[PDB]
């Protein structure tokens, strides 16, 4: 039984090390995950504004006027 215990502990230690790698990978990606969250909010909100406002005559005017300042 001392040989089975040894194989199990070695195998657990490796798993813990892989746990450490998994940890590292996620933490590495965190900051980009946050920025992307903002990015995707920008994209969904703006598309949604467009869909509402694109047949509204005031907006059609406003947009032709905006490039002139």
């Amino acid at each position: 039984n001392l040989e089975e215990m040894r194989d199990e502990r070695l195998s657990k230690i490796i798993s813990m090390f892989q746990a450490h790698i998994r940890g590292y990978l996620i933490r590495k990606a965190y900051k980009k995950l946050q920025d992307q969250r903002i990015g995707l909010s920008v994209i969904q909100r703006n598309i949604r504004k467009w869909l509402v406002l694109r047949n509204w005559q005031w907006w059609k005017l406003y947009a032709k006027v905006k490039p002139l300042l």
Partner: protein, 152 residues
């Protein structure tokens, strides 16, 4: 036990992950492990399963209140020490000089324990800037330290 400082961090992360699976006040049980990883703990897959983690997206979803206790349950998971890691790698070091071949390194990482994908392996070796030498050997002690100390 849990510092309010800590409960705050958990909320921040929880909301990020909530957003990322469809804002609705719940995180997929499959992403349980990753939330906790973001919070700075290193659970084995078997740990996150024991607290309620699922094998695939879409089976179960957790609101924050069901999630908090999952987090508390993993928070005390066993975490490897450097000494443990060196002992483990030493069993593959053929002459005890501190080198292991890159192919062996890949065998232990994707062929043993909770096997990591080829993609995951290539990435940690990339991020840690671990190079092999002309005969394909790497110093496992550098790699172990780089992984342990983290991306920053």
């Amino acid at each position: 036990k849990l510092s309010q400082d800590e409960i705050d961090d958990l909320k921040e992360v929880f909301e990020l992950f909530d957003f990322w699976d469809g804002r609705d006040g719940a995180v997929d049980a499959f992403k349980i492990g990753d939330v906790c990883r973001c919070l700075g703990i290193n659970p084995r897959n078997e740990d996150v399963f024991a607290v309620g983690g699922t094998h695939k997206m879409g089976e179960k979803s957790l609101p924050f209140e069901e999630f908090l206790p999952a987090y508390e349950g993993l928070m005390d998971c066993e975490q490897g020490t450097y000494a443990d890691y060196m002992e483990a790698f030493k069993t593959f070091d053929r002459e005890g000089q501190g080198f292991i071949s890159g192919a062996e390194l890949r065998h232990v990482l994707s062929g043993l324990g909770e096997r990591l994908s080829d993609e995951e392996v290539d990435e940690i070796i990339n991020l840690t800037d671990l190079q092999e030498d002309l005969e394909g050997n790497v110093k496992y002690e550098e790699f172990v330290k780089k992984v342990m100390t983290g991306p920053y």
